[PDB]
């Protein structure tokens, strides 16, 4: 809303965008992961102080190492300790998105369960929850084959990223396409 | 020439067979006699046992584009039947 | 939202306008478009060339009068009340930001935010030679899809024009072609959000399941009619010449 307009001050800018970036963590969220960080809140905010963290939290939004942060933690963040949870939520979800984004590409779903889920480097008995929680994460679709140790999954995993299925895209999309013409040769032609 | 059949027969009959039995089947004395064949046969073999993990040649290039073209054939068949619709003139 | 009808009658004369105006790529023949704009579907009844001037040597520089529309609508009204201004057209094929300005003129003249109309005066590629836009906001403008109505009255004289499956395939490439590039475009154009917006639905493929069998199972019966499809042939034309020739090849009396 300010984006087009409204000249401001930095103490305004960062502190708000701090408080913003704070409120990201007092969001936390449907993750996020990545965000408006791209937008000129950064340098500007991060830089330093908690912005260091705040930025390193973007790292935590990727890294998801407790003690790359639970080291960092002072009161203000530990003031809401639930990021330790939220990071577990992160580490799951963080690991998840790409897994969801990438690992299967080949109609990505299964991710099922355990080692795959512990590939989040968050463990099986938490898989028994964090993984188990789905939209009890707020997100995951699908269900569980516990026996076979298999998630059923479906979407509600969006993202802003790029770079990848770009490639994979046209391949199949050329593939049928090509192999069309085989058929697509004479059908109406002949 | 006998045993190559039996080899396939064992292959067929046995995923796994004691390197004994096969030799016993091969009438061989040394199983390394056998072992050569089986590995000439390229048979999965652990200790004491000829195996067939794949008893057969499955895939391997040709015999394609027909007989397992899903819609393609079908579409060809369509195309064909459409020519049964088209050559219908 | 209110996505709209299209009047071919428009479309036609529209190019006549373009034609009449001898508008060229330098130019876009512009004009009213008519209908009634209330519903979540808007209709295009008609449309009117607005005698106009366009200059992109200076973008905002261009000339038009409303007062056409003024006198126009009167008659239009006098012609029909249902004319009520839905928006306007131009040639196009594409936008030029001055459109925005131009758009807003009609805002005075329209109920809703009025309706832009692009036309491809060369009708070049595909479905529509046309886009219709409504402004927005970080501005917005947007294309809601649109299409023809009946207008069978149209469709009939239409019928006097013209005169199975492989096509259906054919577009298969098309979007994909651009698509990947369109990334690589924007990728290496800006080397936006909407791309990722696309990215998700992508996995919506390799999706296929033994539900596939159903297909197979289904396809079976589809073929069952086979023996029937030509069975009647099998039976029908074969035993037909045996009753006409025996009658005939033997007819042959005197």
UniProtKB/Swiss-Prot annotation, chain A:
All copies of domain PCI, residue ranges: 1-158
Role description: Acts as a regulatory subunit of the 26S proteasome which is involved in the ATP-dependent degradation of ubiquitinated proteins.
Q: Which family does it belong to?
A: Belongs to the proteasome subunit S11 family.
As a miscellaneous remark, the entry gives: Present with 12400 molecules/cell in log phase SD medium.
Protein name per UniProt: 26S proteasome regulatory subunit RPN9
Chain's gene name? RPN9
Which stretch of the intact protein is present? Answer: 198 to 387 of 393
Curated annotation (Swiss-Prot), chain B:
Top-rank taxon, per record: Eukaryota
Which family does this protein fall into?
A: Belongs to the proteasome subunit S14 family.
What does the protein in this record do? Acts as a regulatory subunit of the 26S proteasome which is involved in the ATP-dependent degradation of ubiquitinated proteins. Necessary for activation of the CDC28 kinase.
Misc remark:
Present with 9890 molecules/cell in log phase SD medium.
User: By what name is this protein known?
Assistant: 26S proteasome regulatory subunit RPN12
**Which organism's genome codes for this protein?**
Saccharomyces cerevisiae (strain ATCC 204508 / S288c)
From Swiss-Prot, chain C:
Which PROSITE patterns does UniProt cross-reference here? MPN
Q: Name one GO cellular component term.
A: proteasome complex
Quote the Pfam families the UniProt record gives.
JAB, MitMem_reg
User: Which residue numbers delimit the MPN domain?
Assistant: 4-137
What does the PTM comment state?
N-acetylated by NAT1.
Superkingdom of this protein's organism: Eukaryota
Keyword terms: Acetylation, Phosphoprotein, Proteasome
Q: Which GO terms describe its biological process?
A: proteasome-mediated ubiquitin-dependent protein catabolic process; ubiquitin-dependent protein catabolic process
Q: Does the keyword Phosphoprotein apply?
A: yes
Q: Which GO terms describe its molecular function?
A: metallopeptidase activity
For this protein, the record's Gene3D superfamilies field holds: Cytidine Deaminase, domain 2
Q: Which family does it belong to?
A: Belongs to the peptidase M67A family.
Extra facts: Present with 19800 molecules/cell in log phase SD medium.
Q: What does this protein do?
A: Acts as a regulatory subunit of the 26S proteasome which is involved in the ATP-dependent degradation of ubiquitinated proteins.
What name does the UniProt record give this protein?
26S proteasome regulatory subunit RPN8
This chain's source organism reads Saccharomyces cerevisiae (strain ATCC 204508 / S288c)
């Amino acid at each position: 809303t300010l984006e087009p307009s409204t000249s401001i001050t930095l103490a305004e800018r960062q502190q708000l965008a701090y408080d913003l970036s704070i409120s990201a963590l007092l969001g936390d969220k449907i993750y996020n992961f990545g965000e408006l960080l791209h937008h000129p809140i950064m340098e500007t905010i991060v830089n330093d102080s908690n912005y260091d963290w705040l930025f390193q939290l973007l790292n935590a939004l990727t890294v998801g190492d407790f003690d790359k942060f639970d080291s960092l933690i002072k009161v203000q963040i530990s003031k809401i300790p639930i990021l330790a949870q939220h990071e577990s939520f992160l580490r799951q979800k963080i690991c998840l998105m790409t897994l969801i984004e990438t690992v299967f590409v080949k109609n990505i779903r299964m991710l099922s369960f355990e080692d795959i889920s512990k590939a989040t480097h968050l463990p099986k008995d938490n898989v028994e929850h964090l993984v188990m929680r789905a939209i009890s994460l707020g997100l995951l679709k699908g269900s569980i084959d516990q026996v076979n140790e298999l998630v059923t999954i479906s979407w509600v995993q969006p993202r802003i990223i790029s770079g990848d299925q770009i490639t994979k895209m046209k391949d199949r999309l050329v593939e049928w396409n090509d192999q069309v013409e085989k058929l697509g040769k004479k059908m109406e032609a002949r | 020439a006998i045993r190559d059949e039996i080899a396939k027969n064992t292959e067929l009959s046995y995923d796994f067979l004691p390197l004994s039995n096969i030799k016993a089947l091969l009438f061989f004395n040394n199983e390394k006699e056998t072992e050569k064949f089986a590995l000439e046969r390229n048979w999965p073999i652990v200790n004491s046992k000829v195996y067939f993990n794949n008893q057969s040649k499955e895939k391997a290039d040709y015999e394609d584009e027909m007989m397992h073209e899903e819609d393609q054939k079908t579409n060809i068949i369509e195309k064909a039947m459409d020519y049964a619709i088209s050559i219908e003139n | 939202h209110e996505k709209v009808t299209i009047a071919p009658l428009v479309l036609l004369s529209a190019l006549d306008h373009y034609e009449r105006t001898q508008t060229k790529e330098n130019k876009r023949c512009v004009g009213v478009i008519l209908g009634d704009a209330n519903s979540s579907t808007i209709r295009v009844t008609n449309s009117f060339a607005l005698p106009f001037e366009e200059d992109e040597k200076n973008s905002d520089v261009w000339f038009l009068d409303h007062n056409y529309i003024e006198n126009m609508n009167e008659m239009c009204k006098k012609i029909n009340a249902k004319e009520k201004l839905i928006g306007w057209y131009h040639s196009g094929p594409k936008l030029r930001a001055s459109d925005l300005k131009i758009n807003e003129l009609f805002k005075k003249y329209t109920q809703n935010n009025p309706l832009l109309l692009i036309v491809d005066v060369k009708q070049q590629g595909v479905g529509l030679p046309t886009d219709a836009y409504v402004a927005i906001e970080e501005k917005t403008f947007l294309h809601l899809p649109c299409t023809i109505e009946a207008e069978e009255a149209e469709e009939i004289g239409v019928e006097h024009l013209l005169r199975i499956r492989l096509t259906n395939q054919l577009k298969s490439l098309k979007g994909l072609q651009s698509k990947l590039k369109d990334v690589v475009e924007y990728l290496d154009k800006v080397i936006h959000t909407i791309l990722g917006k696309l990215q998700d639905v992508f996995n919506l493929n390799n999706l296929q399941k033994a539900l596939t069998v159903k297909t197979n199972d289904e396809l079976m019966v589809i073929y069952i009619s086979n023996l029937v499809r030509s069975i009647i042939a099998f039976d029908d034309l074969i035993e037909n010449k045996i009753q006409n020739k025996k009658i005939q090849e033997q007819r042959v009396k005197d």
